[PDB]
Design a protein around this motif. Structure first.
Motif, PDB file in Angstrom:
ATOM      1  N   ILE A 178       0.807  -1.210   0.000  1.00  0.00           N
ATOM      2  CA  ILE A 178       0.000   0.000   0.000  1.00  0.00           C
ATOM      3  C   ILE A 178       0.839   1.258   0.000  1.00  0.00           C
ATOM      4  O   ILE A 178       1.920   1.319   0.619  1.00  0.00           O
ATOM      5  N   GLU A 179       0.299   2.286  -0.646  1.00  0.00           N
ATOM      6  CA  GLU A 179       0.932   3.590  -0.683  1.00  0.00           C
ATOM      7  C   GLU A 179      -0.155   4.648  -0.577  1.00  0.00           C
ATOM      8  O   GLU A 179      -0.886   4.905  -1.533  1.00  0.00           O
ATOM      9  N   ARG A 180      -0.287   5.221   0.619  1.00  0.00           N
ATOM     10  CA  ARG A 180      -1.238   6.293   0.876  1.00  0.00           C
ATOM     11  C   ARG A 180      -0.691   7.570   0.210  1.00  0.00           C
ATOM     12  O   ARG A 180       0.490   7.909   0.401  1.00  0.00           O
ATOM     13  N   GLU A 181      -1.544   8.276  -0.561  1.00  0.00           N
ATOM     14  CA  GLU A 181      -1.187   9.538  -1.241  1.00  0.00           C
ATOM     15  C   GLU A 181      -0.669  10.552  -0.208  1.00  0.00           C
ATOM     16  O   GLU A 181      -1.296  10.725   0.840  1.00  0.00           O
ATOM     17  N   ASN A 337       4.893   5.249   8.158  1.00  0.00           N
ATOM     18  CA  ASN A 337       4.778   5.085   6.724  1.00  0.00           C
ATOM     19  C   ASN A 337       4.209   3.667   6.513  1.00  0.00           C
ATOM     20  O   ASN A 337       4.935   2.690   6.657  1.00  0.00           O
ATOM     21  N   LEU A 338       2.901   3.565   6.259  1.00  0.00           N
ATOM     22  CA  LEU A 338       2.238   2.273   6.024  1.00  0.00           C
ATOM     23  C   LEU A 338       2.804   1.608   4.779  1.00  0.00           C
ATOM     24  O   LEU A 338       3.019   2.279   3.766  1.00  0.00           O
ATOM     25  N   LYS A 339       3.136   0.304   4.893  1.00  0.00           N
ATOM     26  CA  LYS A 339       3.790  -0.401   3.799  1.00  0.00           C
ATOM     27  C   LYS A 339       2.974  -1.547   3.260  1.00  0.00           C
ATOM     28  O   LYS A 339       2.916  -1.732   2.048  1.00  0.00           O
ATOM     29  N   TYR A 340       2.410  -2.362   4.156  1.00  0.00           N
ATOM     30  CA  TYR A 340       1.631  -3.544   3.740  1.00  0.00           C
ATOM     31  C   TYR A 340       0.346  -3.687   4.509  1.00  0.00           C
ATOM     32  O   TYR A 340       0.201  -3.202   5.639  1.00  0.00           O
ATOM     33  N   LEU A 341      -0.585  -4.402   3.899  1.00  0.00           N
ATOM     34  CA  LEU A 341      -1.848  -4.744   4.498  1.00  0.00           C
ATOM     35  C   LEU A 341      -2.055  -6.245   4.251  1.00  0.00           C
ATOM     36  O   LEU A 341      -1.940  -6.709   3.110  1.00  0.00           O
ATOM     37  N   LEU A 342      -2.309  -7.002   5.317  1.00  0.00           N
ATOM     38  CA  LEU A 342      -2.527  -8.453   5.213  1.00  0.00           C
ATOM     39  C   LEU A 342      -3.963  -8.801   5.536  1.00  0.00           C
ATOM     40  O   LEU A 342      -4.538  -8.258   6.477  1.00  0.00           O
ATOM     41  N   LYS A 343      -4.552  -9.713   4.735  1.00  0.00           N
ATOM     42  CA  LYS A 343      -5.872 -10.233   4.999  1.00  0.00           C
ATOM     43  C   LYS A 343      -5.596 -11.609   5.606  1.00  0.00           C
ATOM     44  O   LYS A 343      -4.904 -12.430   4.995  1.00  0.00           O
TER      45      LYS A 343
END
Ligand SMILES: C[C@]1(c2nc3cccc(C(N)=O)c3[nH]2)CCCN1
Length: 350
Positions: A178-181, A337-343
């Protein structure tokens, strides 16, 4: 029809699910007949936080149950609870204040998700999944299961599940990069800070539209500082299961979402017990709540120049601490700095 990868489409469907938002509200004992999803506002939540702060002032000052009654009643007036024609339970202790502070944190994210869903445009020619994806202002990509970053992430999940959290095990369903603007730009003053770590942050699925659109946030000024162990900051764990517990999944809802964020920890202020702070001592950039158990430091690896504490749990050598596992807290939103999102799929053994 959307051209987004099927895992991304499924992620968008989960986080914008209106029925899941209503369910989260019911779980908190909120009266949906008196306070529906559409009637929640930042203003109302902020006033409820303010009242909660009035309750904590009275409890810490040692006020009687008769004294706290009006304060407790005030909170329920602002946030109607499901109690029919009966008297609600009195909010007369730290535990009740903490439980209500946590609930308001959730209501704040639910309000953000619902505002996105309602504050845009309607075009039936567009797939609503694509429309809702655009509202997040976040680039979401599926990480290749055979890539080195997926291998590191899987090892991190595999190795940091605490023995005390063995009522369930975790299966990684999808890994998203993920990459938040604007987040990269915001993180720039902290990008070369020492002690940058890749850490876990768990949250209810119903909070993710808010987290992706607004980033991880600190509780507002109105929130009680005593409602949180280390005050009003952003909390991370180095143990996947510690953060996974905060997804609040169950047998009836076993799919959760967890984040991996790069956190610029810098000079850590090491604590063993609760310290309800708003600001850090001079020269400190974070708080590290010292756990009895820590991931083995010799097994620490680097992913894109960031420390990944994916070692199996070992004794930290820390005596007389209130924490079984570490936790890390930052008091400036720009340090994340958010890098990944896991389900994740939670397999309950119980
Ligand atoms: C209890 C509380 C919390 N403490 C944590 C410690 C480590 C990780 C997490 C997480 N969510 O991944 C935590 N969340 C305090 C503020 C929000 N909720």
């Amino acid at each position: 029809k959307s051209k987004l990868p099927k895992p991304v489409q499924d992620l968008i469907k989960m986080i914008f699910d209106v029925e899941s938002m209503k369910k989260a509200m019911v779980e908190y004992e909120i009266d949906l007949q008196k306070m529906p999803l559409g009637k929640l506002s930042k203003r109302q939540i902020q006033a409820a936080y303010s009242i909660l702060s009035e309750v904590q002032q009275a409890v810490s000052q040692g006020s009687s149950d008769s004294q706290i009654l009006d304060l407790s009643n005030r909170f329920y007036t602002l946030i109607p609870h499901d109690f029919g024609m009966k008297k609600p339970p009195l909010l007369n202790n730290a535990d009740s204040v903490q439980a209500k502070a946590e609930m308001l944190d959730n209501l704040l994210d639910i309000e953000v998700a619902y505002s996105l869903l309602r504050g845009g445009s309607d075009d039936s020619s567009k797939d609503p999944i694509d429309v809702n994806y655009e509202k997040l202002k976040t680039d979401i990509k599926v990480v290749d299961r055979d890539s080195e970053e997926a291998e590191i992430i899987r090892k991190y999940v595999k190795n940091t599940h605490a023995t005390t959290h063995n009522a369930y095990d975790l299966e990684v369903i999808d890994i998203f990069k993920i990459e938040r603007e604007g987040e990269c730009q915001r993180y720039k003053p902290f990008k070369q800070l020492h002690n940058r770590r890749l850490l876990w942050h768990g949250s209810r699925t119903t909070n993710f539209a808010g987290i992706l659109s607004q980033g991880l946030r600190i509780a507002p000024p109105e929130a009680p500082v005593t409602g949180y162990m280390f005050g009003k900051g952003i909390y991370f764990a180095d143990m996947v299961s510690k953060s996974a517990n905060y997804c609040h999944t169950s047998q009836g809802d076993p799919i959760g979402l967890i984040l991996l964020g790069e956190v610029a920890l810098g000079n850590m202020y090491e604590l063993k017990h609760a310290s309800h702070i708003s600001k850090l001592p001079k020269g400190k950039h974070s708080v590290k709540g010292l756990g009895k158990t820590t991931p083995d430091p010799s097994a620490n690896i680097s992913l894109d120049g960031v420390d990944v504490p994916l070692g199996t749990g070992i004794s930290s050598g820390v005596n007389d601490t209130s924490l079984l596992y570490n936790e890390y807290i930052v008091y400036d939103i720009a340090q994340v700095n958010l890098k990944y999102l896991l389900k994740l799929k939670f397999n309950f053994k119980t």
